[PDB]
Amino acid sequence: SAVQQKLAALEKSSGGRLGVALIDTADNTQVLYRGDERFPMCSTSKVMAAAAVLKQSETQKQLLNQPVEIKPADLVNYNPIAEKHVNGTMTLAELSAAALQYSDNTAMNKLIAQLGGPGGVTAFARAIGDETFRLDRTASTLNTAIPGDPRDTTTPRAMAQTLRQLTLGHALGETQRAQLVTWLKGNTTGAASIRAGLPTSWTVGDKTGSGDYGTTNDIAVIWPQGRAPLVLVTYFTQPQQNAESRRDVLASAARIIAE
Ligand SMILES: C=C1CS[C@H]([C@@H](C=O)NC(=O)/C(=N\OC(C)(C)C(=O)O)c2csc(N)n2)N=C1C(=O)O
């Protein structure tokens, strides 16, 4: 289609590898660009961990208010919220918000621990029908996004279908889905990504990711006015390990999608 020709040109101009999946819930039409290729997830996996903890809270009613100790050994590479509560506690709600809205990696590790390890996150994905997602590692002081490594990857097609089920579908209970949507809409890290390519009258919830090999990711649920919502996944990674971030590529992909 015309959109795929433009995304291919964007990718060629960028020097990297671009992956896009759009789902239009109006008639379930899809637009894919490398939609079945693997990409390193980076911080975009946090949505699946936060969703898995929300799912547990459907039976453990008070779970989100449970206090969790933050210890100095808990701190990893990037912890802007958790470092403010070392030798104190945060609730699972506050950790979920920190992971999703400030991409706090210590907060993500507490979600992972609550789920019994990364296999608990992957398990929740399999349970809601995502056969592609795999979370293999916790966040650590040294993380990787190495070309060809299957660890901690998914495909754009898979993550878009998953993000739709979690946010617009009913993979979660009604209060849980609304909490996740609120969390995503309140993200602070995405202004330069997918949001930057979209008409400002559209409502967006998103979660970003960034890593080495200049990996630059964003996954978003999009509410245009007077129109069925969309879900858009944009993954981007580069051949050089020390490559710079390219949030502009994600903004440009989203602008191409929005036509
Ligand atoms: C700007 C950041 C870094 S921390 C956090 C995380 C998730 O993507 N990224 C990393 O932990 C990370 N590097 O972070 C910095 C850049 C702070 C770093 O430690 O060098 C990384 C490398 S490989 C991999 N997988 N994740 N998420 C974001 C985001 O864009 O939302």
Question: Which of 105, 83, 99, 258 has the alpha carbon at shortest distance from 180?
Answer: 99
Q: Is the distance from the beta carbon of residue 211 to the nearest atom of ligand 1 less than 6 Å?
A: yes
For the chain, the farthest-separated pair of C-alpha atoms sits apart, in whole angstroms, at: 55
Which experimental method was this entry solved with? X-ray
* Of 226, 225, 188, 228, the residue nearest 206 (C-alpha): 188
**Joined tokens for residue 107:** 């907060």
For ligand 1, is residue 138 a contact (CB within 6 Å)? no
CA torsion 98→104→108→110, rounded to 10°?
-80
Tell which residue, 164, 50, 33, has the closest CA to residue 104.
50
DSSP-based three-state secondary structure for 222: strand
Q: Is 209 in the pocket of ligand 1 (CB under 6 A)?
A: yes
How far is residue 3's CA from residue 251's CA, in Å, rounded to a whole number?
14
Nearest ligand 1 atom to alpha carbon 41: 25
Give nearest CA residue, ligand 1 atom 25: 42
Closest protein CA for atom 1 of ligand 1: 210
Terminal CA-to-CA distance of the chain, rounded, Å? 12
Q: Report how far ligand 1's centroid is from the alpha carbon of 174 (Å).
A: 31
Indicate which residues carry an active-site annotation.
43
245 lines ligand 1 (CB under 6 A): no
Domain covering 1-259 assigned CATH 3.30.420.10 in the classification? no
Query: How far is ligand 1, taken at its centre, from the CA of residue 225, in Å?
Result: 33
Torsion 142-145-150-154 (CA) sign = positive
> What are the beta bridge partners of residue 203?
223
Cα(82)–Cα(56) distance, rounded to whole angstroms?
Answer: 22
β-sheet bridge partners, residue 86: none
Alpha helices in 72-231 (DSSP H): 92-101, 105-114, 118-127, 156-167, 174-185
Q: How many residues does the chain have?
A: 259
| The token pair that represents 160 in the structure block | 């878009």
Ligand 1 lined by 120 (C-beta under 6 Å): no
| Tokens linked to 233 | 């996944």
Q: Which residue has the tokens 């379930």?
A: 28
In this structure, the residue with its CA closest to atom 10 of ligand 1 is 211
The C-alpha atoms of residue 47 and residue 209 are separated, in whole angstroms, by 11
- Residue 162 near residue 122 (C-beta atoms within 8 A): no
- This PDB structure is determined at a resolution in Å of 1.7
Does 40 contact ligand 1 (Cβ within 6 A)?
Answer: yes
At residue 82, the 3 state secondary structure works out as: helix
Decide: helix, strand or coil at residue 81.
Answer: coil
Helix axes 2-14, 247-257, angle to 10 degrees: 170
Q: Which of 41, 83, 101, 143 to mutate to test the pocket of ligand 1 (most atoms within 8 A of CB)?
A: 143
Phi, psi of 8 (to 5 degrees): -60, -45
For 199, phi then psi, to 5°, come to -55, 135
Binding site membership of 103 for ligand 1 (Cβ less than 6 Å): yes
Residues 81, 66 contacting (CB under 8 angstroms):
no
Domain ranges of the chain: 1-259
Burial class (CB in 10 A: 0-12, 13-18, 19+), 138: middle
Contacts 24+ apart (CB under 8 A), 145-149: 145/40, 145/42, 145/211, 145/212, 145/213, 145/215, 145/237, 146/40, 146/213, 147/213, 147/237, 147/239, 149/40
